[PDB]
Amino acid sequence: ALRFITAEEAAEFVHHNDNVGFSGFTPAGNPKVVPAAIAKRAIAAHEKGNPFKIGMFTGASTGARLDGVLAQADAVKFRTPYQSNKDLRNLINNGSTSYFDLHLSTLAQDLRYGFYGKVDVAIIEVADVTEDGKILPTTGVGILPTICRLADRIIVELNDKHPKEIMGMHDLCEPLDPPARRELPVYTPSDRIGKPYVQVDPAKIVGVVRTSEPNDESDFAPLDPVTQAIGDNVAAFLVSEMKAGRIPKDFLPLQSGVGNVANAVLGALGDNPDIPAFNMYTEVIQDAVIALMKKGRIKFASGCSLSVSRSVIQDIYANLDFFKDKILLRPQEYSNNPEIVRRLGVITINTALEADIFGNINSTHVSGTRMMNGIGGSGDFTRNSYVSIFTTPSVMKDGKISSFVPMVAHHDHSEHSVKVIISEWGVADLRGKNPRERAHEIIDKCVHPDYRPLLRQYLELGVKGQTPQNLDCCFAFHQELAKSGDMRNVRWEDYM
């Protein structure tokens, strides 16, 4: 039978060098009390002279009570595929651990393929665990089905705050693997192809820890004119494309990242009457989506996690009557699947840390060296979307930093994949343009006035060829930031 234990007893099932997979996608759906117990245990081993580090496989980001505590404990032998915690991020950038970010849709199958070793244990947060081994996830799916299948033992965390009435909001499954794989039967963003729970051998459950962990509440989200501008441009562009005949009149499924811009984009879409009621086929469903949903603005939402504030999650749970049939959570293997994304003609909208005049995007490394979060699913989406869009305020640091540079210090998306770029200044449709033509378009429409003439001068430095990159000074902007702290101080005659 199912054995109930403490977070301390559960932590004993994790040993040094073990590879652990965690449930959830973003803090949502992730274990919150056991990982901290592992950390104590890990630290107690360190100061005793004994080594203690585990390999970590997750869906995406985890709370501060996962990566944070584990990172502060210096017990991370390796991490994948996406993170978003300051402690772990520093540990990484200080070269104190091994981190490799992957396209989110690929981790599950690659685990099955045996590309990354063994999964020793799986720690999961649940809304309900049956005696016959049926698991009901909470608010995030990630790689749940795969870690439960591959793990030697499973440590369950039964959260008080998530009701079993949620049953039906998840669509869990895995496909056969080559050479036996069939198609993934989703032709609409609301199609169900799996089960509302994951089935495992109850014998693998080494224990069930009871918890009662509420969602955090929404923390300070001020409005910003630059993002208001960006969000409007996105919405206006899209309606404009439909009437131009480049997007079907009934619109298409959408995908957006998380953040202020995303929020502004969603708000703009909802307020533009020319944008028909739409569905989401995203990664994470945020408050902004729920808000539009209550106004009938968004008809349905497909995602990998429901990452909403406490006020919003309580409203949903109090109204399963309304939300149950409008929200569907899938493993990232499906929510970010190239096959599904391309078939449905999902329109993707993602952010850029920086972009260059030839349409290349950097979404992970600051100055090309410091890791940020991870490529995430921006590649899975951008690459296969009907039309890929990248948004970003034109400048930063009171204008001393330009979001647009001659060449990105780190390439995450290439000229062959980025179709449209949008800032507060306007939109640059890159389709059908060569390098020089898209540079002028990006310069005139997206770049901040303070940097437009300088980037125009970059295109006239005498370089011959398809792409006018000047290897002697393509990184002058980044170099100048390090020297003066203000990229506007660049003068090409100084960098050559």
CB of 133 to its own copies, least distance (A): 26
Measured distance CA(74)–CA(53) in Å, rounded? 7
Of the listed pieces 220-228, 289-297, 321-329, 381-389, which binds its own copies according to CB under 8 A? 381-389
Q: Classify residue 8 as exposed, middle or buried by CB count within 10 Å of its CB (0-12, 13-18, 19+).
A: middle
User: Buried (b) or exposed (e) across 203-219, using 16+ Cβ within 10 A?
Assistant: ebbbbbbebebebeeee
User: Which residues within the stretch 19-78 sit at the binding site for its own copies (CB under 8 A)?
Assistant: 78
Q: How many helices, marked H, and strands, marked E, lie in the chain?
A: 17, 27
Which residues, 6+ apart, have CB-to-CB distance to 185 below 8 Å?
191, 193
- 50 annotated as ligand-binding: no
Q: What are phi and psi of 224, to 5 degrees?
A: -140, 125
Sign of dihedral through CA atoms 431, 436, 437, 439?
positive
Contact 488, 450 (CB under 8 A): yes
CB of 60 to Zn ion, least distance (A): 15
CB of 100 to its own copies, least distance (A): 5
User: Which residues within the stretch 390-409 sit at the binding site for Zn ion (CB under 5 A)?
Assistant: none
Written as six digits, the tokens of 365 are 């490394």
User: Which residues within the stretch 110-129 sit at the binding site for its own copies (CB under 8 A)?
Assistant: 113-117
Residue 371: contacted member of Zn ion, its own copies, none (CB under 5 to 8 Å, by partner type):
its own copies
User: Which residues within the stretch 399-438 sit at the binding site for its own copies (CB under 8 A)?
Assistant: 409-412, 414, 416-417, 431-434, 436-437
Measured distance CA(52)–CA(12) in Å, rounded? 12
Residue 378: contacted member of Zn ion, its own copies, none (CB under 5 to 8 Å, by partner type):
none
Measured distance CA(210)–CA(212) in Å, rounded? 7
Specify the pairing of strand 420-423 against strand 426-429: antiparallel
H or E segment and range at residue 458: helix 452-458
Of the listed pieces 117-125, 208-216, 358-366, 382-390, which binds Zn ion according to CB under 5 A? 358-366
User: Which residues within the stretch 93-112 sit at the binding site for its own copies (CB under 8 A)?
Assistant: 93-95, 98-103
CB of 312 to its own copies, least distance (A): 28
User: Which residues within the stretch 345-364 sit at the binding site for its own copies (CB under 8 A)?
Assistant: 345, 360
283 flagged as catalytic: yes
Residue 379: contacted member of its own copies, Zn ion, none (CB under 5 to 8 Å, by partner type):
its own copies
The full length of the chain comes to 496
- 77 annotated as ligand-binding: no
AA letter at 479: Q
CB of 283 to its own copies, least distance (A): 16
Q: Pick the closest to residue 452 from 398, 409, 490 (CA basis).
A: 490
- 231 annotated as ligand-binding: no
- 412 annotated as ligand-binding: yes
Q: Does residue number 462 form part of the binding site for its own copies (CB under 8 A)?
A: no
- 259 annotated as ligand-binding: yes
Instruction: Decide whether 319 or 369 has the Cβ nearer to Zn ion.
Output: 369
Instruction: Decide whether 61 or 364 has the Cβ nearer to Zn ion.
Output: 364
Written as six digits, the tokens of 285 are 């469903």
Of the listed pieces 144-152, 256-264, 283-291, 463-471, which binds its own copies according to CB under 8 A? 463-471
What SS3 class is residue 25? coil
Question: How many other C-beta atoms lie within 10 A of the C-beta of residue 401?
Answer: 18
Total residues binding its own copies (CB under 8 A): 78
In the set 125, 241, 283, 480, the catalytic residue is 283
- 410 annotated as ligand-binding: yes
Instruction: Decide whether 30 or 97 has the Cβ nearer to Zn ion.
Output: 97
Q: Classify residue 182 as exposed, middle or buried by CB count within 10 Å of its CB (0-12, 13-18, 19+).
A: exposed
Alpha helices in 181-309 (DSSP H): 225-244, 260-271, 287-294
User: Which residues within the stretch 177-196 sit at the binding site for its own copies (CB under 8 A)?
Assistant: 177-179, 181-185, 187-188
Q: Does residue number 371 form part of the binding site for its own copies (CB under 8 A)?
A: yes
Of the listed pieces 68-76, 81-89, 305-313, 364-372, which binds Zn ion according to CB under 5 A? 364-372
Q: Residues 408-427 vs Zn ion: string with x where CB under 5 A?
A: ----x---------------
Q: Does residue number 383 form part of the binding site for its own copies (CB under 8 A)?
A: yes
CB of 320 to its own copies, least distance (A): 28
Specify the pairing of strand 426-429 against strand 361-362: unpaired
Q: What is the dihedral of CA 413, 365, 354, 401, to 10 degrees?
A: -170
Measured distance CA(282)–CA(66) in Å, rounded? 24
DSSP code, position 413: B
Residue 250: contacted member of its own copies, Zn ion, none (CB under 5 to 8 Å, by partner type):
its own copies
- 462 annotated as ligand-binding: no
Q: Classify residue 458 as exposed, middle or buried by CB count within 10 Å of its CB (0-12, 13-18, 19+).
A: buried
CB of 338 to Zn ion, least distance (A): 18
Instruction: Decide whether 29 or 55 has the Cβ nearer to its own copies.
Output: 55
Written as six digits, the tokens of 170 are 């998840």
Of 168, 368, 399, 426, the one binding its own copies (CB under 8 A) is 368
Give the binding site for Zn ion (CB under 5 A).
364, 412
Task: Please enumerate, by residue number, every residue annotated as part of a binding site for CoA.
Answer: 257-261, 373, 377, 397
Task: Please enumerate, by residue number, every residue annotated as part of a binding site for Zn(2+).
Answer: 410, 412, 415-416
Task: Please enumerate, by residue number, every residue annotated as part of a binding site.
Answer: 257-261, 373, 377, 397, 410, 412, 415-416
Enumerate the active-site residues. Answer: 283
